[PDB]
Amino acid sequence: EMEKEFEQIDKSGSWAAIYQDIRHEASDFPSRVAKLPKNKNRNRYRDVSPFDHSRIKLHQEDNDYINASLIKMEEAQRSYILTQGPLPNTVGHFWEMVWEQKSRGVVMLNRVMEKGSLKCAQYWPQKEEKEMIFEDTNLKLTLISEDIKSYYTVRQLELENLTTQETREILHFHYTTWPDFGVPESPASFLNFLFKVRESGSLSPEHGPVVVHCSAGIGRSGTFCLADTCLLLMDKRKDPSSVDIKKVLLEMRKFRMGLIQTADQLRFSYLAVIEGAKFIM
């Protein structure tokens, strides 16, 4: 059981060691499309690339590339799109992807500014009366409502395909309190946030995959997917303690490189799953 494995690694201070074994066992697949010279300005970080096999393709004949991966968890029956925080020049691609994949929710785990630098473009409207038009992808986005809470904000957005005049409601879940350094002290507000996204229906199979991002789409984004998938597997299985976090993480790393960036994020992921298991048992 992971609770005992937690005490062991913690008492022995072995987190950096476990983390390095995960790094060494992780899959390595080609990312040729990401490295094409025509795609250099579509990537926020030169060392964070989607694998070719799991990359999301845009349905635009010109250039189909976005820094985004489909993570398919077959046993849990959950999919996720993990992506980088959009760049000034990829905001239109981001919303085209949301439209094409039939996503109902966007999960944002970063602030636009952290450590005095921009981690993400402002890709949604700040006021009801000031909608955004993406001329490159023929989409209009309107803020419908905004509910600001202590630890997160939920926004209802309307996305309109200007080509077909179809409209969809998108939910934006913005976790606003992840600290600039390290991880939250307690996983309580992160679990509350994760249950709110679940309650919305955004993670349900009647919709396209949820879009999850931070700045690179691998660290905080990884922690979100890892916790959700592990808690779902503990519901589904005859023996809940058959769930090995390390194995789940390695299965997810087949789909996008580098998920969980530090030994602190790994420790935090264990704590979130262990605590979340109390609310699920």
**Of the candidates 227, 83, 93, 101, which has an alpha carbon nearest to the alpha carbon of residue 170?**
101
Domain extent listing, the chain: 1-281
Rounded to 10 degrees, the C-alpha dihedral 112/49/266/73 comes to: 110
Taken in order 273, 77, 170, 85, is the CA torsion positive or negative? positive
Cα(76)–Cα(227) distance, integer angstroms = 12
Cα(141)–Cα(132) distance, integer angstroms = 5
Please name the helix (run of DSSP H) or strand (run of DSSP E) that holds residue 221, with its range, or none.
helix 220-236
User: Could you tell me which residues are annotated as the binding site?
Assistant: 180, 214-220, 261
DSSP state of 256: S
* 207 phi, psi to nearest 5 deg: -125, 165
Answer yes or no: 225 catalytic: no
Cα(130)–Cα(75) distance, integer angstroms = 43
Q: What is the resolution of this structure in A?
A: 1.9
> Which residue spans within the chain are E strands per DSSP?
55-57, 65-73, 78-83, 105-108, 113-114, 117-118, 132-134, 139-148, 152-161, 166-175, 210-213
User: Could you tell me which residues are annotated as the binding site for substrate?
Assistant: 180, 214-220, 261
Active-site residue, selected from the candidate residues 120, 214, 225, 230: 214
